[PDB]
């Protein structure tokens, strides 16, 4: 009877991997970085793109897993590994190395998490300049109707950096951080047709045309 599970809140409020990247133990410049967009993954992108304008808070879950890489030493002992995830809002200083001053995060929020514990989680508010997030943008970045065309003239959400706080281990360890978004308290407007053609690029709608549906033999075929 009830249409409860088909509410927008239930539809979108499930964690989804939006991106995942890797970094190395000592390395040299073994830090990772990610400009935050929601269009690199197909599943979440389609769910969000069923609507033109959205508004919601976010639940961020990080799943960080490491693995031993080959080494030449005798019996390398792994001490527990701690990681730092720093958020650099647009305009802030950017880490250029694993031992940069930016990592001090006096103002920039960041998480310190030790392996073997519950995955770290953070909620974040509605961070938009406008009165709603924009899923599509039929315009340009420059008033001369030139420069960039699409939603990447709007996307400016800052960067996300990843590093080992532990370091110098006698044997190398490679880590993989997986970012997960879960929209909370969602508000959607102007529904639009589901995506039909496979996604091609994260920064534009560009598609390769495909057929409307699967095919059958005859109109009376069953």
């Amino acid at each position: 009877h009830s249409r409860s599970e088909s509410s927008i809140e239930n539809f979108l409020c499930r964690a989804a991997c939006v991106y995942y990247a890797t970094y190395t133990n000592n390395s040299e410049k073994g830090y990772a970085e990610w400009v935050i967009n929601t269009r690199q993954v197909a599943q979440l992108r389609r769910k969000l793109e069923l609507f033109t304008y959205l508004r919601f808070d976010l639940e961020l879950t990080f799943v960080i897993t490491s693995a031993q890489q080959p080494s030449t030493a005798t019996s390398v002992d792994a001490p527990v590994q701690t990681h730092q995830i720093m958020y650099v809002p647009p305009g802030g200083p950017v880490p250029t190395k694993v031992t940069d001053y930016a990592w001090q995060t006096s103002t920039n929020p960041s998480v310190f998490w030790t392996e073997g514990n519950a995955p770290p989680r953070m909620s974040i508010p509605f961070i938009s300049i406008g009165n709603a997030y924009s899923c599509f943008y039929d315009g340009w970045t420059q008033f001369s109707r030139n420069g960039v065309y699409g939603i990447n003239t709007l996307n400016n959400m800052g960067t996300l950096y990843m590093r080992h706080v532990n370091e110098a281990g006698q044997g190398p360890i490679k880590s993989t951080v997986r970012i997960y978004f879960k929209p909370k308290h969602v508000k959607a407007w102007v529904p639009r047709p589901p995506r039909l053609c496979q996604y091609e690029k994260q920064k534009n709608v560009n598609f390769t045309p495909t057929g409307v549906t699967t095919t059958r033999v005859g109109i009376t075929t069953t």
């Binding site: 065309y149 560009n206 598609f207």
Partner: protein, 249 residues
């Protein structure tokens, strides 16, 4: 009956029914929702009136047409003049697509108004050109086949994907009507201001895109007049302009 607005009074009426966007009638920006602190200019009659764009011909092969809305009336009268002179603008529209054939003709058009019709390219590693997306008082046309990859900056105009990578048969979610020549003569859609922000620049952002796509092609026996035109007439409604300054296209 008739629909009279600002010196212009199209009469195309027969009971019938005007599709009022998403159930919202266009209104001026409320002081509760605004941020631009300067007082707007509301030309009213001079701007909120029926501008009739160039007509196009519906052919037995025609795939469809589209117009970007701000850049369709961009050059038409005082609407265009205020548009050139102001940094910010906000308008609703009343769109009237007029097509008439005879009882011995047959065919059917989908007249839809897509908010935020971001369109893709044929060469997937670049975005289409401004002129490719836009046609001032000149409807741009969809294609009967997939356009070529080699084309550096062209719009993927294969109609069955509507240039947006979607199912053309699902464009009905956007406010729309059908012009079935069997039972129809025109389509009227009253669109409100659709945007994430209270006001936006009218050259940089085409908030809406009108699409006329024939789903059942035009046909007629030999003898019935063979030139069936489609005429688009759009009227701004509750137009507001903020941030007066120099002007430039």
């Amino acid at each position: 009956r008739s629909i009279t607005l600002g010196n212009s009074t199209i009469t195309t009426q027969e009971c019938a029914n005007v599709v009022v966007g998403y159930g919202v009638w266009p209104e001026y920006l409320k002081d509760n929702e605004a941020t631009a602190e300067d007082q707007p200019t509301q030309p009213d009659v001079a701007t909120c009136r029926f501008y009739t764009l160039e007509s196009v011909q519906w052919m037995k092969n025609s795939a469809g047409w589209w117009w970007k809305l701000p850049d369709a009336l961009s050059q038409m009268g005082l609407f265009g003049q205020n548009m050139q002179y102001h940094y910010l603008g906000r308008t609703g529209y009343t769109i009237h697509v007029q097509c008439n054939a005879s009882k011995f003709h047959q065919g059917c058009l989908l007249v839809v108004c897509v908010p935020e019709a971001e369109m893709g390219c044929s060469n997937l590693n670049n975005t289409p050109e401004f002129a490719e997306l836009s046609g001032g008082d000149t409807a741009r046309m969809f294609t009967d086949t997939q356009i070529g990859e080699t084309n550096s900056k062209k719009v993927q105009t294969a109609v069955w994907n509507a240039g947006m990578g979607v199912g053309v048969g699902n464009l009905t979610i956007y406010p729309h009507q059908w012009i079935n020549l069997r039972t129809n003569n025109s389509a009227t859609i009253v669109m409100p201001y659709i945007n994430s922000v209270p006001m936006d620049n009218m050259f940089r952002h085409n908030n809406l895109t009108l699409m006329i796509i024939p789903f059942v092609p035009l046909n007629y026996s030999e003898g019935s007049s063979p030139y069936v035109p489609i005429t688009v007439t759009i009227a701004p409604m509750c137009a507001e302009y903020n941030g007066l300054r120099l002007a430039s296209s």
